[PDB]
Symmetry: D3
Subunit: 265 residues, 6 copies
């Protein structure tokens, strides 16, 4: 089109704070946090038996709580589960206009996003919803990274893409520990001395390139070690250096760390 | 894999009898016909205001009537409508195991079929349905025929593909109001005399090639003029010659005509 | 996208009148013709040594003549020629904003259109042109028909696509006579009796499908026999039936013929409106299907009737 | 690349005469025929128990017989059979330089041709063969026509592509009779009258488009009715009209019929020369517009004249 | 498919032990080794004049020796050589059912594997072979890594995919020394201090992603320095961390090292 | 094709020396340098108001100066600018046969190169230019790296491909300092200590793979810190290791540094010739593999040693 890359969404995304839908007592705290994006979770932080109740809890929270200027997103279950369709139907039929975004996990190709888009669009039209939802996806599988560009171009709704390093590692068969960060066995040996390198380099850089090509925000995923502030800082700094615009917080203390690294200047 | 093309489903598909879901009085008449496949319709034979009730009737018929050995299909609404998702959700959640198949209309690419497959599969798993549904699709748009092969390879559930000449003509901007058959203004002029040619040749042939490549049944669609048996025979014969295995009946009289042409 | 297929340009395109840019004495009459689109030619109707002058003539006509409500287009030389870049540079630098469109010949892939788009866009920006040109292309080669869909989706500027039967046949190695129309040696023999069929069926239909998929106007090309009005009517009727919206006029006589065919007859229109009324009545009765003159009509029939109507309301 | 479409091989291909490799007595007659291309068959005209012997026969025929100016091709068995690899290996290891080409049947995708190319290339290198083989392929399946362009672009060796109407119809599940030609049940009905149309239109046109896009010769396949001479002519004329350059002969009578349709008449050649001479004379006087008897000539009208003259000189 | 990614072959592949077919006196030591996979070589460890004899040796070895529970593979010559067809023809026509697998070198596209598949399938059918051969391929060229996913999906026979660092480096025009491992000239300079990084990161990660997407086993290739046990461990650990399941042994004492790193807990 | 990968152009490309077309007083110094390739710039080193003059300057320099055996290239403006078409038209219509190459910046897809190829080919035919121009491109955007293989295969004119790390970083939204090199915030933390890693790894390797697949020269782009020779050396050495054959010089002093790194050392070539000799001896006694200094060495090492020599 003889201008370069499309501009990404202008909204801040320095930090996405996650909380399980099964704990409504956390919602007001999340709303009061310094996080730019709130992720209410129906997926991995919620046991299968609790998913139906968590779904109801989230719908009530969306309709009943003051979320301020925060971007409100919900991580639904995967398309390889029986839960995902009910997540989408109930959310789009019952949740009010305050809902901003849906997060789709384990995306492995463009058609996965198209599928959710097909369903979401129909319900929006059926219910006469005035504010169209945006999409964000998680790259957390071999298929996801292998198909990262087609996924980035898969929907006009798409605004963000996250790397889920833990589930990515599991999918890739990576012999890693914890969630993200330095890996003990990934180092170069030179004259008896060890130098640790970045085992996530390609996955992060490819995600960034795919996102920037198609006007999407690339985002860094969870970091597991809550007691390692400097580990988080290093991980976030690497991601920012590679072009990512923010990082998940799965613990309240991580929000300040993410804001420290990702706030522009 | 260095073998011949995939084998198509072995089930009979000589004729598919259509009937609006808003006319439940037709259902037992359809069930008693000589049609191999029964298509209960929620789409273009049903007014928008009646689609919700038509859906309720179809579910009742699936759980209520004796369909014998018929292949029981339901044509849902298109993905560009607000009706399609409720069609699928209600059917898979409420209809018993007698439902065999759903027909997806106005398919423009493989992702459309993938989208329905995503939804259907999740509900089957959630409800523990023992008999997985098959799919059939209609090629009835410009995009459809342009992407016919990718559509033919779009799902393991896919068993059949029909050419819908009515919507196809509209989408293509074809100057006509008739449904299939001979076109008055499509002829060759040689030394004063006119010779009428087949305006549907490529569409049908492309569909057959796509279907045979991927082990799918290619089917001819609706013939509008139910007062013209010889017109129907001509259309059905052309389709058979091109490799299609059957044809829709949109009226009881057409069922006998279809079986005449397509019975091996 | 989950929407209707992209709507084509609403502008009329029933007839495209061609005229060599080397003959400016005809320009005035073309402007006063009944053609919806005017095509001033720099390509095959102009000898190589006459191209430079024809280029200057066309630019002068774009700036000087009153073209009324005509859609003004120029056919440039192909990307396989040394002429094309000078055609585009001179037109975009020297011609005023009355120029609407350029026609690109012998298009074989999406990249050909993109190449012209790249040049045109840079010059429009450099000169600050206020009305961006639209593109139309000619499918007149084997490569063209084989890659027809990618060509249809090659540029936001693209508004129309023509089948050039004479050059298509040459490229395909077709043993044909004249330009388009019935071919003597293309017939079916049944019981010693011959039945002529359409040797252009796939090319036309595939172009229509590609165009309609991407919101482009499919157009029929030149018909060579100027003395055969009924032959022209036959060719135009086949095109209109397959979905094409208009046809070239390479002779002033053909303009009236094109407009007659590609404007829906009064009989066809009245039938379309009755079907709409019949379907509208069935809706109020709570039915999506009913009977019209002994044949089935339904919701899909509404959209077919709407095809006939909007072309007549043009 | 900003030039005209790739030029096809500059050799005549009006008729390809087939003969089973199990019948070596026919070989000298084929070599003496008026066919441009000779196809010795290892495939469907040869029974499974005769395939090994036919392979030996063909190899001897290539090494021992005088084939004159004929383009010598061998149709091997398909990649879905246990025979194909043995066909290629024995041919490329044992046959002399006189072998020009191999024909690959039932090609469904580009990778089928690539597979054969990989094998053929390695044996040519191992044996030090001096004249590399060209390929030709048969489109005779649904997969083949669906993937026709990718097949056309599948190999630098590829020179020709045929439509096998009978096997194509069987693959497509077409309810047809015989091999090619008019089909009884494929007609248009108007006012009680029937008009028969072409049930092979797209298959033929698409093959021609794919071939001409990639510099390949598009060829029409077998016609079954050996007594229907006018049926053959009609089929050949349709093919010629759609852009095919030749047709198979599976019976010696068909050779004359094929050459008749695909050779320009002496009248057409003469008129073509005159038009080109008129143009040349005009340019000699520095004129851009040519005039022949009647009026003015379109550039496409001289384009075909040059094609016709080029044809006549290819047949010497 | 709305299911998890395809499961890889279940068989062990911690170590692949290579040996030139031109040295049949070493075959019994290989059969007795602790390697899961045995690779009898007809390619780059056999001089051109010795290839015909090595072929006969291997065929005799397949029919003659006790291979126990070893997965028995043969690396044939590449499709750019005149040797490959004779390698495959003789193996499939003359070797018994003890042969498990063929290793295809220098694969640059999916069509390369299809070509070998076409030939193997024909002979298996002609000879009525009871146990169909599996395939493994080596990614050891620029074309290979560029087309790694299409190669991973190239055949139902494909079970494993190896990175060949020696040929890869040559094909890529890498100014490297030795085979794999730390590269002296690949380091980051920070405040007059050198930090060596992984010059093989993308190639290894991309291979793992392609393999896991399509149910293939990703394998690390040869490590040249025999005398460097710690260097081997470092290379093996990096590979394991990135998701590879095993590594070649081109010297007998590398088998134990590979098993130490790749044996699952 | 069943052959080895296509061979790249054989011409030297150890260093590409850039100079703005707006400063013709520096041209003669460039022609006197030890740089293999000369890049006269119409793009980012030239302000918009100077572009037309620089165009005229460059044309005069091409027709007027002695460039010896240098490969003479001109970096035109991008396809997203109004300047590019006039750069091409003027150069191809007015510059003499001494011009060798045009460098296209910000290439995002194959069609970009095709667009320039279409224009260049037509003018060459119109003017009857006897020496067809080659192309080189810069991968300096997200789209460029995502589509890097299709770009590398986009034209028979294409001979070289550069990574432009600064503009790449900007497009990618990378939080980096300077141009290329070590990045302060890109490090691994292990028990309290930091280990810096390569934030350009995939970009460089992917460019090399795309290039080598299609017979193109992969080249490393600008390095910003002119006072940091060791910094330059580390960057050049990483690139050479990954397979890049040369590096830009944007300051005159960088030419020697590029030549030093991208001319294989006598130590490296002696070790290569030593390996080749060892494998001749191995092959002579019926061995496809042998031992070299406690290391494995076989037929694969031959092509490796040949890359060196
Ligand atoms: C072209 C685009 C498309 O989408 S077409 C695909 C979907 N279309 C349809 O489903 C249309 C099906 N057709 C119909 O709705 C009806 O046949 C139409 C055309 C409306 C005519 O209905 P009607 O006037 O009742 O027919 P008729 O009087 O001639 O009835 C004769 C006897 O047969 C029955 N009948 C009628 N239609 C069906 C049917 N589809 N299936 C089974 N039976 C049918 C009628 O009851 C009547 O029977 P009886 O003798 O009273 O027992
Ligand atoms: Cl994760
Ligand atoms: Cl034309
Ligand atoms: Cl046949
Ligand atoms: Cl830069
Ligand atoms: Mg997860
Ligand atoms: Mg319809
Ligand atoms: Mg033309
Ligand atoms: Mg056959
Ligand atoms: Mg190797
Ligand atoms: Mg730049």
């Amino acid at each position: 089109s003889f201008r370069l890359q499309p501009a990404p969404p202008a909204r801040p995304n320095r930090c996405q704070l996650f909380g399980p839908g099964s704990r409504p007592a956390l919602f007001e705290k999340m709303a009061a946090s310094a996080a730019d994006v709130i992720n209410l979770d129906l997926e991995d932080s919620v046991a299968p038996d609790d998913k139906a109740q968590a779904r109801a809890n989230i719908i009530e929270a969306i309709n009943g709580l003051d979320w301020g200027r925060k971007y409100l997103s919900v991580r639904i279950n995967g398309l390889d589960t029986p839960f995902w369709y009910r997540d989408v139907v109930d959310l789009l039929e019952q949740a009010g206009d305050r809902l901003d975004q849906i997060m789709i996990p384990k995306v492995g190709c463009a058609a996965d996003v198209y599928a959710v888009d097909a369903l979401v669009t129909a319900i929006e039209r059926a219910k006469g919803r005035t504010k169209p939802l945006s999409f964000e996806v998680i790259i957390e599988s071999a298929a996801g990274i292998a198909h990262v560009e087609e996924i980035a171009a898969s929907s006009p709704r798409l605004q963000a893409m996250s790397l889920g390093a833990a589930d990515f590692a599991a999918s890739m068969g990576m012999q890693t520990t914890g969630i993200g960060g330095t890996q003990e066995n990934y180092y170069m040996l030179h004259d008896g001395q060890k130098h640790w390198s970045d085992p996530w380099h390609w996955a992060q850089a490819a995600i960034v390139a795919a996102c920037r090509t198609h006007g999407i925000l690339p985002v860094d995923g969870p970091f597991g070690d809550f007691s390692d502030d400097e580990g988080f800082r290093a991980q976030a700094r690497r991601s920012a250096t590679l072009g990512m615009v923010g990082k998940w917080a799965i613990h309240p203390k991580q929000v300040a760390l993410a804001n420290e690294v990702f706030t522009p200047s």
